[PDB]
Amino acid sequence: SKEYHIDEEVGFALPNPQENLPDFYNDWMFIAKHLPDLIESGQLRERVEKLNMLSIDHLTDHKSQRLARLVLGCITMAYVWGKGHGDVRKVLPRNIAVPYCQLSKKLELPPILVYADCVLANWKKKDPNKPLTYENMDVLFSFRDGDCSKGFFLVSLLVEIAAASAIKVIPTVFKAMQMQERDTLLKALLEIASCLEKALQVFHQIHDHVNPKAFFSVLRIYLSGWKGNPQLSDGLVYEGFWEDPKEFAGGSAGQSSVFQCFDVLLGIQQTAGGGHAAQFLQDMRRYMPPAHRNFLCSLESNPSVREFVLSKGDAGLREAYDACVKALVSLRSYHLQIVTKYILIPASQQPTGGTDLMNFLKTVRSTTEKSLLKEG
Ligand code: HEM
Ligand SMILES: N[C@@H](Cc1c[nH]c2ccccc12)C(=O)O
Numbered sequence: 001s002k003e004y005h006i007d008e009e010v011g012f013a014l015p016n017p018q019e020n021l022p023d024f025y026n027d028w029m030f031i032a033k034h035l036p037d038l039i040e041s042g043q044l045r046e047r048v049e050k051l052n053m054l055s056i057d058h059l060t061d062h063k064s065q066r067l068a069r070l071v072l073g074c075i076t077m078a079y080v081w082g083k084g085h086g087d088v089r090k091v092l093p094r095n096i097a098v099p100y101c102q103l104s105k106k107l108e109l110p111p112i113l114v115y116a117d118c119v120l121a122n123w124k125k126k127d128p129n130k131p132l133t134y135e136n137m138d139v140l141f142s143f144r145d146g147d148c149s150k151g152f153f154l155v156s157l158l159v160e161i162a163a164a165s166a167i168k169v170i171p172t173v174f175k176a177m178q179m180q181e182r183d184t185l186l187k188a189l190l191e192i193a194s195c196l197e198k199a200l201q202v203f204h205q206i207h208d209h210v211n212p213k214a215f216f217s218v219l220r221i222y223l224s225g226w227k228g229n230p231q232l233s234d235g236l237v238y239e240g241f242w243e244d245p246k247e248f249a250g251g252s253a254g255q256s257s258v259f260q261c262f263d264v265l266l267g268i269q270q271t272a273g274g275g276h277a278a279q280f281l282q283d284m285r286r287y288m289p290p291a292h293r294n295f296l297c298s299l300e301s302n303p304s305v306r307e308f309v310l311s312k313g314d315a316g317l318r319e320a321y322d323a324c325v326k327a328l329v330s331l332r333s334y335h336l337q338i339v340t341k342y343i344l345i346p347a348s349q350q351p352t353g354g355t356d357l358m359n360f361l362k363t364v365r366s367t368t369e370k371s372l373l374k375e376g
Pocket of ligand 2: 253
């Protein structure tokens with residue numbers, strides 16, 4: 001899946017991202033590099049305001065334009081939120097806004113830090129000989145110290161990598177169906193299930209490397225966007241680029257292609273019925289890179305694995321299919337427990353919004369659970 005920007009090892013994640021830019025953009029790198037202490041001192045907003053209006057013409061390859069998006073994205077957040085106490089900026093300087101809006105228009109990603117920036121491009125191997133594990137990995141950027149950004153951004157990425165083991169099997173599934181190869185398909189569906197079962201254990205690591213109170217109070221506010229945010233009721237104005245303010249949602253893991261990829265594969269019609277859940281998951285594809293957005297297209301336009309499996313009156317083929325759907329439920333069911341610990345409880349500790357966040361996630365899980373065949 002080379003044309004779709006899918007890697008065999010790390011899937012949707014950027015295979016090995018650049019850690020620095022061409023020297024013409026040293027102004028940018030310095031602010032991004034030293035955010036944690038630039039925020040504490042009132043410098044940051046000054047250091048952004050007095051800055052050159054650099055052009056994006058000296059960004060040659062993809063990995064250059066992505067690190068640019070990450071750097072600009074990370075800075076744009078810290079500017080708008082500051083120390084993160086309700087001290088906000090309602091306007092972005094044209095010195096940083098224009099290059100970010102042009103570079104964003106270029107990659108077809110919106111002008112705001114997305115999952116593709118702060119998880120998929122925001123990582124490196126410490127020792128390139130030892131494998132991909134929290135031990136031997138570090139993010140390129142943070143917001144503060146003790147924001148637990150390393151934990152969230154890397155455990156997210158490690159789940160993207162766990163999913164890669166299943167995502168690379170997908171072409172075997174479609175080959176097998178067309179070539180009426182039952183035995184090949186059963187293994188490939190059992191293989192996908194097995195890899196999604198592994199991805200669940202990877203999810204447990206979040207308890208080890210992320211602190212609820214720190215996460216909820218610190219990192220969550222920088223990852224916060226400006227769609228339906230009363231802090232910025234009419235969104236944010238990108239000075240000189242857009243006439244009037246624009247609204248764009250924050251950098252959630254809900255911009256991940258992993259879960260949406262296997263919903264489409266298994267014929268789980270999430271983005272049908274025209275509910276809030278369906279409308280949310282459809283909107284999040286705007287915040288995915290255009291290559292991945294096209295990949296979920298290809299999956300949709302292929303013949304249904306679901307309606308194929310049901311035809312054959314084959315118990316083995318149904319069980320293998322179910323195993324993939326159960327694996328996907330288990331992941332969503334566990335993710336609800338995570339949100340309970342990391343959103344709901346924290347939000348009740350500090351002096352019905354969280355009630356229908358849980359309804360959104362439970363809707364999406366229930367839609368998945370309804371696709372189970374149960375040998376019928
Ligand atoms: C402390 C950890 C986490 C918290 C607090 C958290 C919180 C949330 C919340 C509140 C949502 C609802 C959508 C939104 O508000 O934008 C969401 C959605 C989502 N999260 Fe997470 N999340 C966490 C970890 C993860 C991880 C590690 C993954 C791995 C891929 C993940 C994948 C998703 C996906 C795919 C959605 C979209 C809805 C769905 O398809 O079920 N989350 N998350
Ligand atoms: N997408 C949210 C931000 C958000 C909600 N829940 C999250 C969990 C993790 C990270 C970010 C978030 C916004 O509009 O601003």
